[PDB]
Short mmCIF file of C-alpha atoms and ligand atoms in Angstrom, two decimals:
data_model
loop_
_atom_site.label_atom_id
_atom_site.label_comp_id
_atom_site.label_asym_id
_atom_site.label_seq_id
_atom_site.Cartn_x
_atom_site.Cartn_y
_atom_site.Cartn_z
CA UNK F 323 5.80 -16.48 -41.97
CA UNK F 324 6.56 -20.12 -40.19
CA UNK F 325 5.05 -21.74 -37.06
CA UNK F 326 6.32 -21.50 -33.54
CA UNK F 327 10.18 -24.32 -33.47
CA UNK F 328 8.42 -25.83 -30.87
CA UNK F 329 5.53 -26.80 -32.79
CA UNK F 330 7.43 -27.71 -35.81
CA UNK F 331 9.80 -29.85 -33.57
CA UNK F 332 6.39 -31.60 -32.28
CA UNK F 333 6.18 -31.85 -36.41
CA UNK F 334 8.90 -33.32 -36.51
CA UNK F 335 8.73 -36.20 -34.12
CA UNK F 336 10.37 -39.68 -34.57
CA UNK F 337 12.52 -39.73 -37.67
CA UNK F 338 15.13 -41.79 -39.67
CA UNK F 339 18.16 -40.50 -40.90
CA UNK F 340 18.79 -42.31 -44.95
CA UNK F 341 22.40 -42.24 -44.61
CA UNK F 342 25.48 -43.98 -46.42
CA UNK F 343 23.39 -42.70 -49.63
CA UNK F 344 23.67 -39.09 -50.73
CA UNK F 345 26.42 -37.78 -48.58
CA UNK F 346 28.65 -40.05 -50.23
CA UNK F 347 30.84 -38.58 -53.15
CA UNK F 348 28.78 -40.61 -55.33
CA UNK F 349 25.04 -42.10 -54.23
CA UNK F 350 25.34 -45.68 -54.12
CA UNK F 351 29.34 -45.51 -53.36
CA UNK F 352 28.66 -46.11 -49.17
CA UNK F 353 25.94 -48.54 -50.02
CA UNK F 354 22.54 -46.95 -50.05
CA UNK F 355 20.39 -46.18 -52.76
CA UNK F 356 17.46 -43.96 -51.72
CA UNK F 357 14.35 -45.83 -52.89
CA UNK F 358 11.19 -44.44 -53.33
CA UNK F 359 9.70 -47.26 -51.68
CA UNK F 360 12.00 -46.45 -48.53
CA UNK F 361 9.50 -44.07 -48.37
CA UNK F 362 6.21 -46.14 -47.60
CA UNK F 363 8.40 -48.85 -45.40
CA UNK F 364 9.49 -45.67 -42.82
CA UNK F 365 5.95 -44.08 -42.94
CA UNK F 366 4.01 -47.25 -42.32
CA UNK F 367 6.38 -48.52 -39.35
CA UNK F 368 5.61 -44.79 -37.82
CA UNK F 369 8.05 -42.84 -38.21
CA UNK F 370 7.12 -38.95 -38.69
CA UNK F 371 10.28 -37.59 -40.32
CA UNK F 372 13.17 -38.54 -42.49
CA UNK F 373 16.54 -36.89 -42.14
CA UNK F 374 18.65 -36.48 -45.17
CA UNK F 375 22.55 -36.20 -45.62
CA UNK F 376 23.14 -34.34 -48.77
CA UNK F 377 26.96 -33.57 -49.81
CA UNK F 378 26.51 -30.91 -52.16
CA UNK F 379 29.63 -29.80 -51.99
CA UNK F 380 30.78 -32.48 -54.65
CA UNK F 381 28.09 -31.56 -56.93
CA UNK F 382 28.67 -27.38 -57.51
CA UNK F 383 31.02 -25.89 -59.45
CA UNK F 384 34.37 -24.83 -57.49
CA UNK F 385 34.09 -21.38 -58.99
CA UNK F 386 31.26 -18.83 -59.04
CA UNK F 387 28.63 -18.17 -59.19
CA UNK F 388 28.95 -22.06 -57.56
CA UNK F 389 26.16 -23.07 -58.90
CA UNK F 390 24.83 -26.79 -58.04
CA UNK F 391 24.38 -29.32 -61.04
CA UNK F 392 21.55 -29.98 -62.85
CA UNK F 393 21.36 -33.41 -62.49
CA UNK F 394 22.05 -33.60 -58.71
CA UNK F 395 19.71 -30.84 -58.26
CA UNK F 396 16.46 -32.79 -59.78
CA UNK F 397 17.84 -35.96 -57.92
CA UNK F 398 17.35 -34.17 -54.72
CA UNK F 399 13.92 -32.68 -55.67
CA UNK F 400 12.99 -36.17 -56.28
CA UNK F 401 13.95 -37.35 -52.97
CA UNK F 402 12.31 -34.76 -50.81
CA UNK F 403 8.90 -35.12 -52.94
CA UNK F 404 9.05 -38.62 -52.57
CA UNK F 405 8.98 -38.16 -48.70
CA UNK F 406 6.59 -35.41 -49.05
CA UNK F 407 4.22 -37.51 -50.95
CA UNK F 408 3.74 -40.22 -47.38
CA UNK F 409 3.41 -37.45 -45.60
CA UNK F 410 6.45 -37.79 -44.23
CA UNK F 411 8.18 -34.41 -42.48
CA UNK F 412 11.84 -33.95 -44.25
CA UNK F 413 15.21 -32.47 -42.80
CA UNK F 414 17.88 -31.79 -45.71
CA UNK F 415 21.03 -30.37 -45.11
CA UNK F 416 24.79 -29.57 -46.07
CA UNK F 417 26.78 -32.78 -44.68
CA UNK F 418 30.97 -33.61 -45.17
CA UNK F 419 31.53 -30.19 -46.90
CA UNK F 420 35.47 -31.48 -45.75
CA UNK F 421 36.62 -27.99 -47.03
CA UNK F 422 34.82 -25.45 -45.67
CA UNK F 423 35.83 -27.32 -42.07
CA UNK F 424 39.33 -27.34 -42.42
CA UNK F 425 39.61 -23.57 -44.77
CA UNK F 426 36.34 -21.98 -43.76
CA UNK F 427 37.92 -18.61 -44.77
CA UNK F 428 38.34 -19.79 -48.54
CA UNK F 429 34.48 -21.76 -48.38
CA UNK F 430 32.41 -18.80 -46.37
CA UNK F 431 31.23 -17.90 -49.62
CA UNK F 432 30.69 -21.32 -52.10
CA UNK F 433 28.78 -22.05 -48.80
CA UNK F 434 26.57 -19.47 -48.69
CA UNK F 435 25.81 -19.57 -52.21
CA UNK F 436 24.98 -23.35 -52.33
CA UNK F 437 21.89 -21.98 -49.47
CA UNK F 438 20.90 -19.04 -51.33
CA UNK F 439 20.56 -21.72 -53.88
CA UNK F 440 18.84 -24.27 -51.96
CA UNK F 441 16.57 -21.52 -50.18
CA UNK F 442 15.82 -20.18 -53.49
CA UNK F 443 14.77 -23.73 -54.81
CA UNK F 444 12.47 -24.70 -51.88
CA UNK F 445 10.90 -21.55 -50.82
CA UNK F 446 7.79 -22.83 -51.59
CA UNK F 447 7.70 -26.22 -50.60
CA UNK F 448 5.63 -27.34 -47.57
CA UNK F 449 6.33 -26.06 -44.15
CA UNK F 450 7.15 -29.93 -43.42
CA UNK F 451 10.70 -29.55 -45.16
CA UNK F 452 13.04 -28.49 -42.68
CA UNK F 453 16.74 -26.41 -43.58
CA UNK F 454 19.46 -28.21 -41.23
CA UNK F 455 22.83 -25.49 -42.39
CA UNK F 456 25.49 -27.57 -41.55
CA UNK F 457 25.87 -31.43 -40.03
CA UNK F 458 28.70 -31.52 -37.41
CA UNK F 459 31.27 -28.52 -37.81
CA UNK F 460 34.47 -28.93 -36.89
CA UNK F 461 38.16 -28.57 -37.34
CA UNK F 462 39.19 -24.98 -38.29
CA UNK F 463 35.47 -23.81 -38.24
CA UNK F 464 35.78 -23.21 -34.66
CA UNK F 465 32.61 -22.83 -32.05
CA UNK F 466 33.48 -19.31 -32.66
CA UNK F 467 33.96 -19.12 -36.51
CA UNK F 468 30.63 -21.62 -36.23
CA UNK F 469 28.26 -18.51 -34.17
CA UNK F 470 29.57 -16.69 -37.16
CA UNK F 471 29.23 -18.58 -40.26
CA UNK F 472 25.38 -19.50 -38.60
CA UNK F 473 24.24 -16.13 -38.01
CA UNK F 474 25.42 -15.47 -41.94
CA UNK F 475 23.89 -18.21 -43.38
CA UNK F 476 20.63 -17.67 -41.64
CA UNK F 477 20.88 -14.28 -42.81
CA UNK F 478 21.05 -15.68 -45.99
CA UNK F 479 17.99 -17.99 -46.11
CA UNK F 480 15.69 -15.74 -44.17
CA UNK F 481 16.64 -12.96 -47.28
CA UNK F 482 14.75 -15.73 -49.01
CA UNK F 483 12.44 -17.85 -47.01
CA UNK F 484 10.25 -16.64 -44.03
CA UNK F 485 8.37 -19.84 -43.59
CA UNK F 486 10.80 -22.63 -43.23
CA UNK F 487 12.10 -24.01 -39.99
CA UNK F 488 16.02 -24.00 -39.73
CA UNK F 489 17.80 -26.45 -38.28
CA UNK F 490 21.41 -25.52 -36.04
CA UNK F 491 24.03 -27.85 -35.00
CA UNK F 492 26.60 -27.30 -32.25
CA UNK F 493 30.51 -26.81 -32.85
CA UNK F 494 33.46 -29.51 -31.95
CA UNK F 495 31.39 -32.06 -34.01
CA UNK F 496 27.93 -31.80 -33.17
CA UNK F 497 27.57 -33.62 -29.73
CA UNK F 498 27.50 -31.72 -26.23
CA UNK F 499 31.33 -30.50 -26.10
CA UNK F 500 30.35 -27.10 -27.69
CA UNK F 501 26.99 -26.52 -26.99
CA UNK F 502 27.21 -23.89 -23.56
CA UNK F 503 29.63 -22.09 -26.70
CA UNK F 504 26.40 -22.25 -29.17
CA UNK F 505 24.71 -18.65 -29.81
CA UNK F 506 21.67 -18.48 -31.92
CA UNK F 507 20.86 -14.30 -33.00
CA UNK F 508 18.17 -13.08 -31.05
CA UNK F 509 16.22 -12.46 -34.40
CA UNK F 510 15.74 -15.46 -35.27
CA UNK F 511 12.39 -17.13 -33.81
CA UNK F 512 11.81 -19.86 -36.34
CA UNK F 513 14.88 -22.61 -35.68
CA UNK F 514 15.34 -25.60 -33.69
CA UNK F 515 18.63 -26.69 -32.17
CA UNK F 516 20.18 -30.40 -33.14
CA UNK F 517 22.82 -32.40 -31.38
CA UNK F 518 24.08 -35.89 -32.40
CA UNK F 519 24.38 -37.96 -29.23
CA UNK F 520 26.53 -41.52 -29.75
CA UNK F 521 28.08 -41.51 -26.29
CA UNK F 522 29.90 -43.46 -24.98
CA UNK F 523 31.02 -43.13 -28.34
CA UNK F 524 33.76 -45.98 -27.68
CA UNK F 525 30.73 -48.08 -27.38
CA UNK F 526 28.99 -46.61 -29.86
CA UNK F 527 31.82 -46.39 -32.46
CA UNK F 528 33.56 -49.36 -31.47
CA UNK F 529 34.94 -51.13 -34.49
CA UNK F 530 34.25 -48.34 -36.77
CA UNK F 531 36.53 -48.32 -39.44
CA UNK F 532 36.00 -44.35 -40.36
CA UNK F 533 37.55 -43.59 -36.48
CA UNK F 534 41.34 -44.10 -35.96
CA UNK F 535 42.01 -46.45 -33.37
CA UNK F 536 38.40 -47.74 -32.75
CA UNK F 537 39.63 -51.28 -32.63
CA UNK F 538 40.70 -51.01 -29.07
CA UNK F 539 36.69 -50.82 -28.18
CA UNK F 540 35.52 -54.49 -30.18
CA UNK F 541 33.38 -56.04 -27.20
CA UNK F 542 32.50 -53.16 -25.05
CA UNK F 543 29.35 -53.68 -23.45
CA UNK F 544 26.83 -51.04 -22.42
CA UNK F 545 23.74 -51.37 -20.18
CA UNK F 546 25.35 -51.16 -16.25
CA UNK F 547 22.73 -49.13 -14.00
CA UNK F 548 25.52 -46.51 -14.19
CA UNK F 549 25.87 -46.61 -18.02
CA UNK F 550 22.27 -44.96 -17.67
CA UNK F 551 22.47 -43.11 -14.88
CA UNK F 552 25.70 -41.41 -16.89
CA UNK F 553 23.36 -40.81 -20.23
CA UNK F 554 20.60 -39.46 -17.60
CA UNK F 555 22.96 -36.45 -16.55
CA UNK F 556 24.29 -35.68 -19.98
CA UNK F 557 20.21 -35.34 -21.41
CA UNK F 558 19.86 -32.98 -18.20
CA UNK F 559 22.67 -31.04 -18.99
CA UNK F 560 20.63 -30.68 -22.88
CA UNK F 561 17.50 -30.13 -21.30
CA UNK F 562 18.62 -27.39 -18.88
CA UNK F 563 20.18 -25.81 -21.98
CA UNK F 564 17.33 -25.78 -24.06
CA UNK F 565 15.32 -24.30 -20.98
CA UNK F 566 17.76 -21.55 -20.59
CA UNK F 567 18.06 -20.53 -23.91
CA UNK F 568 14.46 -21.52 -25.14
CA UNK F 569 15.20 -23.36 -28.13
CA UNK F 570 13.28 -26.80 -28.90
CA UNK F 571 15.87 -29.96 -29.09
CA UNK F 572 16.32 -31.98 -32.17
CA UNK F 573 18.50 -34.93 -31.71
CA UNK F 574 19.34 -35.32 -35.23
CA UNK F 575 21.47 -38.45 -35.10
CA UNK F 576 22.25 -41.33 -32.70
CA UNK F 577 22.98 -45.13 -32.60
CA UNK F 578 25.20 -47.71 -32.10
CA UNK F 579 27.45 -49.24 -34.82
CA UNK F 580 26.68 -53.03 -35.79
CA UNK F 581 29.98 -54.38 -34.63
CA UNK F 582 28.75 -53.86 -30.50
CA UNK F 583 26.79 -57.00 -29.06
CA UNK F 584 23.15 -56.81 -30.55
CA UNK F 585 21.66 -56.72 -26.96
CA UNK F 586 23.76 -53.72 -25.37
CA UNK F 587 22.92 -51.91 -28.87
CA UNK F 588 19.40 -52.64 -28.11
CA UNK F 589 19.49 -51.46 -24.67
CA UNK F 590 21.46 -48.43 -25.63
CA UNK F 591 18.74 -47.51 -28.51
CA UNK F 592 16.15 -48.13 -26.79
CA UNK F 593 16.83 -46.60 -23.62
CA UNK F 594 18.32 -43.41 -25.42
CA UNK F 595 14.82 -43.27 -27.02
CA UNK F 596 13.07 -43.58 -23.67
CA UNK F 597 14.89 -40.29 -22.00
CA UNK F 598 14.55 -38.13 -25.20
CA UNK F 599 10.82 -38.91 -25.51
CA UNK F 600 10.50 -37.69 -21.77
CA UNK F 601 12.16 -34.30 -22.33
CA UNK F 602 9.90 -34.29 -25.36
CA UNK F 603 13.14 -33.71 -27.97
CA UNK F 604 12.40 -34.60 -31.55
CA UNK F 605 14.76 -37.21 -32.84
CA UNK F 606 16.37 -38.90 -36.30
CA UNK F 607 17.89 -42.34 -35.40
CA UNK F 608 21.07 -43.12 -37.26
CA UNK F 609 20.65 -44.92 -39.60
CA UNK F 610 18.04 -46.61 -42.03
CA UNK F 611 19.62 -49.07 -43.59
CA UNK F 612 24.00 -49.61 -43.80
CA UNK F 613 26.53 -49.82 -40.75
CA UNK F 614 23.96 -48.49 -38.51
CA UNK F 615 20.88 -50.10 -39.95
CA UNK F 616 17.63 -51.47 -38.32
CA UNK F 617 16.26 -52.18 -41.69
CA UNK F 618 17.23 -55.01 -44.38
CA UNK F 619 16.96 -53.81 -47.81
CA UNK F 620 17.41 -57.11 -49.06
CA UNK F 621 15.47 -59.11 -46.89
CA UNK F 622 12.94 -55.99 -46.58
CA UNK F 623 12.78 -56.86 -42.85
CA UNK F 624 13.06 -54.81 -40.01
CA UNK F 625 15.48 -55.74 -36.85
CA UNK F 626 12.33 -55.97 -34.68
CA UNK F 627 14.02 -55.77 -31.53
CA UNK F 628 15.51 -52.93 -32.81
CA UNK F 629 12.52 -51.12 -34.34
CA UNK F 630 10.70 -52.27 -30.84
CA UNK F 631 13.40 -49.93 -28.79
CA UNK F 632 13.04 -46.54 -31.79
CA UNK F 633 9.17 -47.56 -32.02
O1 LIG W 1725 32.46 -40.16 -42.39
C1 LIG W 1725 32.04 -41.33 -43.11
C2 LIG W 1725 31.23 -42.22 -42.18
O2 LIG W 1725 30.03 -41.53 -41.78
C3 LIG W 1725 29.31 -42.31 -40.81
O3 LIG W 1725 28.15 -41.56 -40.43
C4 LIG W 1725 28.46 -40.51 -39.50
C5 LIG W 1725 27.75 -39.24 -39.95
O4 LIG W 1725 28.20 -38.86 -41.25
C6 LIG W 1725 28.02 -38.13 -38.93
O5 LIG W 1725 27.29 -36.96 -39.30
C7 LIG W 1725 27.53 -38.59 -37.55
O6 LIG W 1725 26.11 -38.72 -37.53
O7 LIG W 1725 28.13 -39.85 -37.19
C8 LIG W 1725 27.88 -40.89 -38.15
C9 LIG W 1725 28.54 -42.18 -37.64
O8 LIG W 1725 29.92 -41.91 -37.34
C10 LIG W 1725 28.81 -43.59 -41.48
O9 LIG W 1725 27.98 -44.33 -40.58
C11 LIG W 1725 30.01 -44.40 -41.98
O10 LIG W 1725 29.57 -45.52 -42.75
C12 LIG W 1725 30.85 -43.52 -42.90
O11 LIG W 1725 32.04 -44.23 -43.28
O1 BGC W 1726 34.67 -37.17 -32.16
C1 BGC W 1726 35.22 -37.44 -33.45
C2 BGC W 1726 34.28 -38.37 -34.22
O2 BGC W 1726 32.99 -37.75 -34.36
C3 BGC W 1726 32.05 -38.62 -35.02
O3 BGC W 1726 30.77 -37.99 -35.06
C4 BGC W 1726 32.53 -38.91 -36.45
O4 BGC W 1726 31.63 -39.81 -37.09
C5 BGC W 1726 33.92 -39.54 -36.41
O5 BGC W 1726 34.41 -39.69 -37.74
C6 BGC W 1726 34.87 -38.65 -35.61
O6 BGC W 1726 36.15 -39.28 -35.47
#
């Protein structure tokens, strides 16, 4: 048996997402590396939990019994044990599975193999490694095919694992769009509910070259008393939420993208920060060290400022 979500969220605390690494195709291809010394650098600035995009998706065979890669496999063990070994609380999950969004039909089942396989694998880890089933579904897998697909998959890692915290996203890409449509089973009394928050995502996003037509935002500012009054009502709107349906927050990702002005990214960041930490919501900034980044892997320098507003 686990621990009360609420207590495991307070586990979970301040955390880092290591993106631009694993949920590449290919680690390395976006840019990162996960280092083991990444490790000691989060835990010794304070951080209390890294987040980890995995795409195992490209790393499984397409035909069953699906089963994930060898190589992959031991590549992720030695990931989460090098987090585990700082003392570090870890979130791993199932990230740009591309398919299963747009034919969830044809991918309910690779899916839910690739957790009975993951399940299976951890079981008996620590009760610091957290099971996040899917980052931001979207597309075809609907908010309704998404209540679905969640009740089945906790269904399948509770067959396995009664100890584990699970981890579940909203619909309509992760953010607040879907979440009044969100329904977690009754049952379940062990998981915590995430939401990625990058809005004003024009200002967020601007410049991103992933988003189509995210050119037309180069040079928005963000920091107007209103800006924050704005973010202030959207929190409450989470808040109220999570008081309704008693489930603990987990805002799994947020940050702004290195083309905005550094000061309205720090004001954003740290601000953002500020009004989670009051509504006492766990948190994984976005990201480490790429697009997004607040550390230099190079330099092996943090952006203080930056750092300053995540703390
Ligand atoms: O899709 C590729 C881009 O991903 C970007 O990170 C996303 C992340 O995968 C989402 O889950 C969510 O958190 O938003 C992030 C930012 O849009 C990444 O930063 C880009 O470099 C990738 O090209
Ligand atoms: O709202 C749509 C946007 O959601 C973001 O979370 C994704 O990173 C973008 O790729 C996408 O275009």
């Amino acid at each position: 048996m686990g621990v009360d979500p609420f207590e495991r969220n307070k586990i979970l605390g301040r955390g880092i997402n290591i993106g631009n690494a694993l949920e590449a195709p290919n680690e390395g291809d976006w840019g990162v590396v996960i280092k083991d010394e990444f490790f000691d650098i989060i835990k010794e600035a304070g951080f209390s939990h890294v987040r980890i995009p995995i795409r195992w998706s490209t790393h499984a065979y397409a035909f069953p019994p699906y089963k994930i890669m060898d190589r992959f496999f031991k590549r992720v063990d030695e990931v989460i044990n090098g987090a585990l070994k700082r003392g570090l609380a870890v979130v791993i999950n199932i990230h740009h599975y591309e398919e299963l969004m747009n034919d969830p039909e044809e991918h309910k089942e690779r899916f839910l193999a690739l957790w009975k396989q993951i399940a299976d694998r951890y079981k008996d880890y620590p009760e610091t490694l957290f099971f996040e089933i899917l980052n931001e579904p979207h597309g075809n897998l609907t908010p309704e095919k998404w209540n679905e697909l969640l009740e089945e998959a906790l269904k399948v890692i509770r067959s396995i694992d009664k100890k584990h915290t699970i981890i579940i996203g909203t619909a309509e890409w992760g953010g607040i769009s879907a979440l009044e449509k969100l329904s977690v089973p009754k049952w379940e009394k062990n998981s915590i509910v995430t939401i990625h928050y990058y809005n004003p995502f024009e200002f967020t996003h601007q410049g991103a070259e992933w988003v189509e037509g995210s050119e037309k935002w180069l040079g928005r500012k963000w920091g107007s008393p209103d800006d924050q009054k704005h973010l202030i009502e959207e929190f409450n709107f989470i808040e109220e939420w999570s008081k309704k349906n008693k489930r603990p927050i987990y805002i799994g990702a947020f940050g702004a993208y290195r083309k905005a002005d550094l000061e309205s990214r720090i004001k954003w960041t740290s601000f953002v920060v500020r009004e989670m930490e009051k509504r006492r919501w766990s948190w994984a900034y976005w990201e480490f060290c790429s697009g997004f980044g607040v550390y230099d892997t190079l330099r092996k320098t943090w952006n203080k400022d930056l750092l300053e507003a995540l703390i």
